[PDB]
Design a protein around this ligand. Structure first.
Ligand SMILES: COc1ccc2[nH]cc(CC#N)c2c1
Ligand SMILES: COc1ccc2[nH]cc(CC#N)c2c1
Ligand SMILES: COc1ccc2[nH]cc(CC#N)c2c1
Lengths: 290, 290, 290, 290, 290, 290
């Protein structure tokens, strides 16, 4: 990268100014998952990008999944799954394992990676300082609403306490597990939790790290890819998308309808995707507005 | 407990005043382990006692072990141990498991128990916000100093950041794992870590929850039990005590020599031991001064 | 009190937790009078109980009477009383004496007693920093409303300035004398003033130290005594009670109707009554709610 | 005062600027006694002058005596005096009376007078919030040091707590009674206490209201009067002055040696003396420096 | 001024108290121009008067004109004027000169004069920290509304940022030039700007330094001069006054209608006019209320 | 700039992180002059670069010259110069013009340019709030020290007040004129003033905008250009450099000897030079250390 003239190194920097000003002093919630989380080079760049934001006076908040890791640990422990539709029933035993893996393993990697750049990252769940609570969610399989155990949605968020942490110059790394109103800890889908914290905290943007270029109208036509779309005409598209796409899209809808100015679905496989989406116009993602 | 006259209910309350005043606004570090951690009734009372302290304007800081739990999980995972002397070699694989169990399991139970009383408890390791670092410790077996993997002592403690958390009305529940200077996470003996945070934070007292009445001069003579002892004549006794006793006693020495006014070894098997040691003279523990 | 097993010393302490949490950070106004004020052992315990509250992070505010002391000083000075019904006409001369005795004698004893435990207690009247004002009250004798001099009710209270003092960790000891709108100092009935500060400050509880077990429905049937009663059915009882009882009861009504959660009439003759009423269920008092 | 041209009304105002700047944000301790305290017109002007200072952002602190009032009350109460030399033995009974008169009568008049201008004045003794302590003083009669009861000197002053009160925009009116180290309240000579608070608080000036023009070298030569004098050559004069003069002069010495820039002895019989001494060069007083 | 008895030096000082209290902690906007700005003795006294206010804890804000100075510099530069009616067309070239003279010359004199008394004065325009903006004003000549270049009225005022400066103990010296919404700097009539800042800042008073005794009903009858007048009956007089008088009077109307308690037109030729108007009843000015 | 792949737009951004972290929360003093000040495209980019820094939470402080502009205005005014050696004698008349041009013209352009990006820029001299003072400097011509009027060096700097302005999120644009100890305003060489504020404020870096590539050892050998040099071996070179170079180099020496970590001489003719020097390694400048 040394053979690039110094006068264009300058212009790409200067073209970040309007987004630097837009984002200065603002909350940005980032849901992190996919291959940006399993490849060492992508995950290092993500950590560095969160340190970037922080050394700009932007306030990143990180929400992480970990689905495959939970599966692998359950298998190492020889815990037999029960399945309704294609969901695993989260028994008390499976919650324990899930909590142990998300907060004790996956979140620790990200904290330590970010903290190679400074004393920034701090891991939390809904359990810590009652930062947020959960309500038992139910799922519908082949038409009928069914219970699949200790799985919930984010209920309410201690907005104030949360915003103090970011003000101290700290980056919350959020494992999505939280008590219900009786203290019973539930596991929350990370895409959903991200949307819910973003709306609670009054975030400026919600970034979705996903394993695709962006939202395709009529997959797999290459002509279908989109830069930007509103909630109205997005929700009208929701019933068509592939199974894996629904969660990333419903979170974008819940967030932007919730008042977040824009939610973004960007390519977690691109190294430094967070930087390209926030500080350049060459975004491969797709932006969502009302 | 209803058949006790109301005029003696009053006196036992009034006799807490001199310790309430002594402890108001002060840091108390509590190392929690043993049966006060595995029996539901004792562990609930401990949680309630930490909420007590906090609703008095005292600042409890909780440091927890978890030795047996780590063993059990390693066995469930079929991870083969390597042993020098009688210590397990903490490989990278064993650290991961240890971190996962201490922070993702054992610390979560205590956080949720305390948080039945309010939004108080918050789990941390040395990794979070770089709250403290570790230095690789070595051990001596049958005379020779030997390496037993990623096991360390607390190196340095972010005293300021730590004291802000307690000031926000929060109870840190500390899992004793911390980066070394190269970011490599080590597991720290919980008795040692407790002594080290206590000295760093300028704690007023260090409480040691242990599975005994107190320190016996010449075990097992019942006539040997002691109420109070200084560092000088305690250190002269250290080479005699049973293997399990050394860590609880060396931490008391490192802490009180470090400037902590008094370290206490109290009976974790007594329900509400923390209350009896802090607010009554009927302590079964043994106090340590210089 | 040493022959009581250490495991019950613990339980009576632990049973204070729910009231400690309820009262942490809250204002409690205590009207102090009667024999809890003239016996050295009771008055010392009261002082110690106010230091207790303060070393729990509770905010006590003390309002005191002094009726008998004023009488005695007037008699020592040979000041002749004028009496309408059974009230003394508070002339300018009698106000001076009253102020001198309440603020210069009775309030000083309590300040010095409390301040044996720390730099806590601070004496004030309505005159100091204009903390509250008075409006000339009139009385009805044998049916007709009559003037009995410079006697008033609390008019308005500098709520903000008052709440700063408690925040500095100080215990206001309030002598109930205050300017009217023309600067003319009036003497205010202490039971009434207590109710009025309690409502102004948003106190959590109002404690009434009185010389009885509690409120009797149909005195002197022992079967008449009550633990708890609301304002509606209390006010319906007011026209029956003994002359001395009216002031303690009307203050409870004005306070709980004013929004104070509960007012209490407790036995000032019991040593440490404040402790038993606040931190035990063995209360001899009687609680008042709406 | 209306027949004075408006162009000289202006100049006398403008000539206050250098003292306004010198005194802005500074502590000025004023000992108030004498006829400036017994004549209604002088005492009203003094009150108004303290409100002046405060509405300039200067920090007045008022210390008051009351010797004659104590005598009169003791006589009304028929309390027999015991006298060694010409001092009254302050028995426990005489302390009580003294405290009652100084704090409950004399200090109340001044508080209410000042508070005709705003919520400024606040009465205190050493007892309140432990603002200062006393040490038992002894006196020498006809050569021998003799005990004359509960009379002391100011020992130590809670400088910080005191300076917070002035910062809240409050004027402390100080009755000079304070606990000794065992809680035993003593009466302190007001001239002495004034010097001691002035030095503790780092006052800019100490003002002494006295019943004379100023310090005369060789009284009663009119040619003897002085504008200014240092400590060295003042102390050399101390053994000559009239009995009543010693206390006003020793306080000036203890204060200016203590580091207070200048102590002043001014004419309490002049209406608005405080204003003339602080904001004009036409001072009748006498200034003291090192 | 030394031959004036010290007892009347005192009374004129004491008669400032009610205005000192009224103005303590309040904003006073002063428009400064005329001969109080060109004579060295008057301008020094004005500077000293602003230091007076500040060393009383009053918050002066200074707005200055400079019409004649701009003319003189334009003439020295040989810049030819264009005139519609009797107004100069402010071209880009004339703005530059105006800004250069007002902010770089006239405002510097006043800053340095005030700052002989302390680190008080600070020069600003609407350009600095976007403290206020301008909207292009038009004028009506012989009946028709006409453009006369880059001349505007104060549009909106950064009230908060402005009030922080005064709180730091600083005196803003305001040159009345400000950007429009496109960044194009305009020159604002100083009388108008003064009224607009006064209303924005919630000033207690607006002082107008002008070259006259006060507002005459039917000039030049000496019997016409007035002490006080409301907005209603003032506005009904506006169409009659001399050309130079309109701006001083319309600003008084815009300010007092805007909520400022009183605007004053005082005699800038009297040395220390600000002092006489604020702290004496011998005002030659004329006060305006609703 | 659109034809550049998005994966290299990312890398140049990511390579700013180590300088972003180094500079976060730090003071950077920038001396601005030369063609970066007279060409519209360069001066706009400079303004934008100062907004960049500010929207990163870096604290820029701008010091500006204006030599040629002063000359031009003096010539337009027909003010005859007096010259000793090749310096103009700054008479009172020339100071006035200099102040008027620097603060009223040159500084206004930069303030308005920066303030197109937000309410950031604020113009000051040493006169405002006494932010810094000057001491009359003398010059040596052909060997002899000679007076050339009201020209000085920065004497002392109100470090605290200055650092508050930057903390409020404001960018001081400094015209280098300041009072001496008698209030007599002097003109200060801008290169010198920049070095002096940088050292006073504890700046992290001093940036020098100059019209060259960088410091040449033996000009004009192209082989002479340097990236980095310490003070020792730089000072040994000072006696050789071209006349225009001395001021830029002596300021670098006074600053880095004064404790500033690094001073930089960079190419004001490169658009966005500030960005390239601070956030890229492709610097054309030359860095100075001890
Ligand atoms: C109050 O909310 C929380 C929750 C978890 C936390 N971990 C570390 C900190 C503070 C630091 N450094 C913290 C705060
Ligand atoms: C502002 O209200 C008051 C009234 C009386 C007081 N006495 C002592 C203090 C403060 C201390 N320590 C105080 C404050
Ligand atoms: C924030 O608004 C402004 C505008 C101009 C200023 N000049 C000097 C200061 C602060 C100081 N000392 C200042 C503040």
């Amino acid at each position: 990268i040394e053979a690039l003239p110094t006068h264009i190194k300058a212009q790409v920097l200067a073209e970040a100014l309007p987004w630097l000003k837009q984002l200065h002093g603002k909350v940005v919630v980032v849901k992190y998952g996919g291959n940006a989380m399993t490849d060492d080079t992508l995950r290092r760049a993500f950590a560095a990008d969160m340190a970037f934001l922080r050394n700009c006076g932007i306030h990143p908040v990180v929400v992480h999944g970990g689905g495959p890791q939970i599966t692998a640990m359950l298998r190492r422990l020889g815990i037999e799954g029960d399945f309704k539709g294609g969901f695993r029933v989260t028994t008390p035993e499976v919650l324990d394992v899930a909590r142990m893996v998300l907060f004790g393993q996956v979140g620790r990697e990200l904290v330590n990676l970010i903290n190679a750049h400074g004393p920034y990252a701090v891991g939390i769940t809904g359990e810590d300082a009652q930062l947020f609570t959960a309500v038992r969610r139910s799922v519908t399989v082949d038409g009928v609403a069914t219970d699949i155990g200790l799985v919930g949605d984010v209920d309410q968020v201690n907005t104030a306490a949360m915003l103090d942490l970011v003000a101290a110059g700290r980056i919350p790394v959020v494992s999505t597990l939280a008590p219900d109103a009786d203290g019973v800890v539930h596991n929350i889908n990370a895409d959903t939790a991200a949307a819910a914290v973003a709306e609670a905290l009054g975030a400026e943007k919600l970034l979705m790290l996903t394993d695709i270029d962006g939202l395709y109208t009529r997959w797999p036509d290459r002509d279908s890819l989109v830069s930007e779309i509103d909630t109205g005409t997005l929700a009208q598209l929701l019933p068509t998308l592939e199974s894996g796409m629904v969660p990333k899209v419903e979170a974008c809808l819940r967030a932007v309808i919730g008042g977040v100015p824009s939610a973004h679905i960007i390519d977690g496989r691109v190294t430094h995707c967070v930087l390209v989406e926030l500080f350049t116009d060459a975004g491969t993602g797709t932006k969502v507005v009302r």
